[PDB]
Structure 1
Amino acid sequence: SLVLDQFGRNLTAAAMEGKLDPVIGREKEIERVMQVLSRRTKNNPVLIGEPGVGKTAVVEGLAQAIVHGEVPETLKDKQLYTLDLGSLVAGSRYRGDFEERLKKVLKEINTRGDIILFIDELHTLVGAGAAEGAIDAASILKPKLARGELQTIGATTLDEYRKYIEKDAALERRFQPVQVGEPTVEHTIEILKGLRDRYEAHHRVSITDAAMVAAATLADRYINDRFLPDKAIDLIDEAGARMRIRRMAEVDDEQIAEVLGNWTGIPVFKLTEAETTRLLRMEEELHKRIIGQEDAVKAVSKAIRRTRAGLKDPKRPSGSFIFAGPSGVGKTELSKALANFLFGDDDALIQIDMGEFHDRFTASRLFGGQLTEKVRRKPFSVVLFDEIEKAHQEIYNSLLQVLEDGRLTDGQGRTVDFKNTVLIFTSNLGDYERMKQKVNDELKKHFRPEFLNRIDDIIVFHQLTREEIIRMVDLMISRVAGQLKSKDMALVLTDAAKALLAKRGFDPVLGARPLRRTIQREIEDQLSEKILFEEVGPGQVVTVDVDNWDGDAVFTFT
């Protein structure tokens, strides 16, 4: 009445006016809500669901059913009133403000006799008012909830229900759980088709079928922080607002792609569902940052095509490849380039090295974990497993079962899925055909051969040839120049200087890892001390040259 208005909104009258969005496919949940609400004693349903599934939508659909008249006589003409605890908890800086406001609300409800409370965030009922031992909202609602005279509808989250409500057995035995699970893709499509009328009326834009299809099919697999259909609705609504400010039209896959690219930072052309054509040109998209290794690039490319086609059994991880060969070939940067191509983010790959995690205590950190939390934050991620030679038997068995069922059971009590995770095992263990037979006999005596059976591909990297080392020197000087062009410094690298950079950079015993150290010592430090001591300044080209070896060497920055 006159006191519920300052604390809540009349859902039944608002549905009578025609303000509420219609609900699609929630017939079972709303029917269960009528089932619980029709009981004599303890007629209080609590909607349990993840944030963003539509619990408030279920309640609003119940109000829509009540106002039209598809309810039994026990729910006919019942004013559904929402109620928030935050408008009662706040302002309780004295002894009894909370109890006074809640007693006034309960008295108005009892006098009206046709009020149902939709108290959202039920788990704060125990924590409201005073502490859980003294008089709180639960202590004043419990003597009236148990006899079924105060009809209330709660809404909460699953973990918060288990942790707050289930601890209080007296309160737990008063609320009937109603599960509202996350809708699938097709139900989200139906929801978007239902709400397209309201959104096209509000935004003054025409939404196509491909627009809602693209919105759902991109929100579901790219955004994992929330749950459908809140994310798809957010995508459509943000795209409509973007169109509305750009007009001062229609919404298609382009608008949804650009808004999700703004949200995530992934480029728009990736988000356009041209997956096959992207898969057609990935040879040069991978070769644009890698040097040589043409057989390796071809092998990994045909592996990516054979795995991403979807023709395999969908009970396995997407791919699982062993990378063998001497260090310094560029396996890590290859994995990074794969992460950049497949998903559009350099941080989409996880870099974990288990050579420091040996015992079972560190295996508790491994799985039971940062890997589990990152594959829960995004299950479309390439994992990198370095140095699998020194593994413990527990790590071996966990890897066996994980790659077996595509599923990991951690120490956190969660079954985390690995169906699209790309596993890369960069192993330094162990001409191209000969390397197959050398490792085939050697891994089967070091590991079990079930490893070699279950794995997908073995890709062997050969040593970097001198001209490929030259192009790597070119690539590193490219980014060095990119970071020093602010001071108008131009670097020219003569062939003899390139040969010295290659010889002081390439350690055949250790590979091409030590380049990053030496190119900063023999080039960047000398250039730094030459700028500091004012031998050269901004705006002059330095064509660096070298004496004492043309085919103890000093670098002259001419």
Structure 2
Amino acid sequence: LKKYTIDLTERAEQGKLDPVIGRDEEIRRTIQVLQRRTKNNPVLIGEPGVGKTAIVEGLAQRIINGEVPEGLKGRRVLALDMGALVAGAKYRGEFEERLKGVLNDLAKQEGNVILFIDELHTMVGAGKADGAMDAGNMLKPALARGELHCVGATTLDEYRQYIEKDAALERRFQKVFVAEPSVEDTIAILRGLKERYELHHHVQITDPAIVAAATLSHRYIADRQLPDKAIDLIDEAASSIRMQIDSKRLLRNKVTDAEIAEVLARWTGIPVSRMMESEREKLLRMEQELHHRVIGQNEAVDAVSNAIRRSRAGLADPNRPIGSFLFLGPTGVGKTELCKALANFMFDSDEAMVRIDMSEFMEKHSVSRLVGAPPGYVGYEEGGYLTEAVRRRPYSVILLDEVEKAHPDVFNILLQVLDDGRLTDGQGRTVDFRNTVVIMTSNLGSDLIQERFGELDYAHMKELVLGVVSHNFRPEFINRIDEVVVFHPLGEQHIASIAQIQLKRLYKRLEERGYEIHISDEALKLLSENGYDPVYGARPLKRAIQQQIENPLAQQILSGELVPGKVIRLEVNEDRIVAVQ
């Protein structure tokens, strides 16, 4: 008994237990089960990192401090470990002499000992070496007779496929559900626990670093549960500052939310850290920073930058994505380019744009590729194309390209992402679109968008295109769109400004090779004859570097006069261009 079971009650007299704050409805319900006549076995069902191990450490602190009823007064909470019972059990019945050694020491205790079996699912099938099970089949009489007082603490899905499968052991435990506390319920958890970390780290932790250790944990960390990550963050931040005082008021020890969001940015990647950066320079110039790489399209950025300012002010709907856009209009105008800009603004990486081409979803059978296959079908455990991608990046700009080429029954899949920000996978797991920006480019009115842009100034392309030919006949999808955005086609004013960032990002490395080129002003309209298109758009400009500028170097090698090291020009003549050394 003293070889295996850790005694939590004498670990509470030394003050070695964490102070437990709250939990008084789940501790009282635990004592209500622990005082039952038969089957006095609570199982603290929760999720990993909810506090179900620090409920019995708030029961064992309670027995010593005496807030328990008489009947649980003066008990002992022993923490049996089923990993130390299957530890060296090689031979036949070395495990069964460990339980029947522990179970017979618990009967000498005449009911003065509470047994905390943490992770009961490790008891289901613990011996089980030759036949029927040996741990939750040896406890099974003394669990039903109300004899050993077994506080279990498993999680809900570990209860579901370990303990619920043994239906004769499932009834010997009573589910004391430990729901995770809310964001305000874990501040008081962490306000009293902060001094137990101040005495260990020799580090002062402010309640600003605690009110933001939980609002940033809950919002940004979605796989963990709340009083496990909020105390991870303060322990990581107090260890990050504990370097700054050891090795090399301005050499601080205080944790503030500057250090808490810095650890969380180092965990997840979301840079909302401090507004003492150029973010004050960035929050009102949010519409013109997109204009750095989205040339023109003032109706486009004033729809997307005003919607992502609407949520950074905490004013947008938290049961809806950050933005739901329909980018109908011409091709090669700034549709796909703004979403790269919007990803390079919000999550500052244009690799965080989940592009989905809806020409792959032409027919109705190809809708379970986005959402996932049902149980029992091909591609079930794989997932969906949209749902699993949003589980990869929950903070991403979803591009749904040419949605008018989708099936009509894929807008039905796209009614719940727009309205509620949810999409359930084929495996019954719901993915959360509340942090994504769902932008949907289309070409459904583009014939009438292009002809009327220099006629109807800035608002009449929105009205009166809807109803004769365009989307109103299927009306449930239009009103779920946040802003329907029409795109004015590009004149010569924009493609001269759009054809300047072709090699601007590669510009900052390749100087010493022998290349630095300033703007030449004579070959401007050579690219503005194939690239500046009223019909097909500005996308043939990207081929107008692959067809116009890059050809007579990489194949004209063998003739023996043109060798690299000299910067090329282009002039308006019938030249078949030369290059002088």
Please indicate, yes or no, whether the TM-score normalized by the shorter chain is above 0.5.
yes
1:420 to 1:262, Cα distance in 2 relative to 1, 3 A: closer
Q: Say if 2:321 and 2:417, in contact at 8 Å, map to a contact too.
A: no
- SS at 2:490 equivalent: coil
Residue type at the aligned position of 1:543: V
Counterpart among 402, 409, 428 of residue 387 in structure 1: 402
**1: CA distance between counterparts of 2:534 and 2:23?**
66
1:393 to 1:500, Cα distance in 2 relative to 1, 3 A: closer
Residue type at the aligned position of 2:500: D
1:493 to 1:144, Cα distance in 2 relative to 1, 3 A: same
Higher helix fraction (1 or 2): 1
Equivalenced residues, count: 551
Give 1:118's aligned residue.
116
Q: Say if 2:398 and 2:438, in contact at 8 Å, map to a contact too.
A: yes
Give 1:301's aligned residue.
305
Which deviates more, 157-166 or 49-58?
157-166
- SS at 1:61 equivalent: coil
1:505 to 1:233, Cα distance in 2 relative to 1, 3 A: same
Give 1:286's aligned residue.
290
- Give the structure-1-normalised TM-score: 0.87
Q: Give the CA deviation at 1:264.
A: 2.7
Instruction: Output the aligned Cα RMSD.
Output: 3.3
Q: Say if 1:546 and 1:553, in contact at 8 Å, map to a contact too.
A: no
- SS at 2:399 equivalent: strand
Give 2:66's aligned residue.
69
Counterpart among 331, 348, 355 of residue 351 in structure 1: 355
Counterpart among 333, 337, 343 of residue 333 in structure 1: 337
Q: Deviations over 1:293-330 (max 9, x none)?
A: 23422343334445655556655444322112211112
Q: Deviations over 1:364-399 (max 9, x none)?
A: 232253433454566554332222213334323343
Which deviates more, 480-489 or 199-208?
480-489
* 1:207-226 alignment runs, 5 A limit: 207-226=205-224
Residue type at the aligned position of 2:401: D
Give 1:151's aligned residue.
149
1:154 to 1:519, Cα distance in 2 relative to 1, 3 A: farther
Residue type at the aligned position of 1:329: V
Q: Give the CA deviation at 1:536.
A: 4.4
Counterpart among 22, 25, 39 of residue 42 in structure 1: 39
Give 2:188's aligned residue.
190
Q: Give the CA deviation at 1:62.
A: 0.8
**2: CA distance between counterparts of 1:270 and 1:551?**
58
Q: Deviations over 1:348-377 (max 9, x none)?
A: 442222321234432223225343345456
**1: CA distance between counterparts of 2:543 and 2:288?**
29
**1: CA distance between counterparts of 2:561 and 2:264?**
49
Higher strand fraction (1 or 2): 1
Q: Give the CA deviation at 1:252.
A: 1.1
Give 2:477's aligned residue.
451
Q: Say if 1:254 and 1:272, in contact at 8 Å, map to a contact too.
A: no
Identical amino acids, percent of aligned pairs: 60
Gaps of 5+ in 2: 247-252, 373-383, 447-452
Q: Deviations over 1:74-98 (max 9, x none)?
A: 3222221223323333444444443
Q: Say if 2:43 and 2:173, in contact at 8 Å, map to a contact too.
A: yes
Q: Deviations over 1:402-450 (max 9, x none)?
A: 5345544554334555445432111122224443246323565574234
Counterpart among 351, 365, 369 of residue 365 in structure 1: 369
Give 1:546's aligned residue.
570
* 1:75-474 alignment runs, 5 A limit: 75-113=72-110, 114-130=112-128, 133-248=131-246, 249-267=253-271, 269=273, 278-306=282-310, 309-311=313-315, 316-368=320-372, 369-375=384-390, 379-414=394-429, 416-429=431-444, 430=446, 431=453, 432-437=458-463, 439-442=465-468, 444=470, 447-474=473-500
- SS at 2:138 equivalent: helix
1:319 to 1:233, Cα distance in 2 relative to 1, 3 A: same
Give 2:17's aligned residue.
20
1:117 to 1:279, Cα distance in 2 relative to 1, 3 A: same
1:41 to 1:514, Cα distance in 2 relative to 1, 3 A: farther
User: In the alignment, is residue 54 of structure 1 matched against residue 51 of structure 2?
Assistant: yes
- Give the structure-2-normalised TM-score: 0.84
Gaps of 5+ in 1: none
**1: CA distance between counterparts of 2:349 and 2:186?**
27
Residue type at the aligned position of 2:192: G
Q: Say if 1:118 and 1:154, in contact at 8 Å, map to a contact too.
A: yes
Q: Say if 2:62 and 2:68, in contact at 8 Å, map to a contact too.
A: yes
- SS at 2:324 equivalent: strand
**2: CA distance between counterparts of 1:288 and 1:280?**
14
**1: CA distance between counterparts of 2:275 and 2:128?**
50
Q: Say if 1:406 and 1:418, in contact at 8 Å, map to a contact too.
A: yes
- SS at 1:154 equivalent: strand
**1: CA distance between counterparts of 2:68 and 2:186?**
26
Q: Say if 1:32 and 1:178, in contact at 8 Å, map to a contact too.
A: yes
Which deviates more, 82-91 or 49-58?
82-91
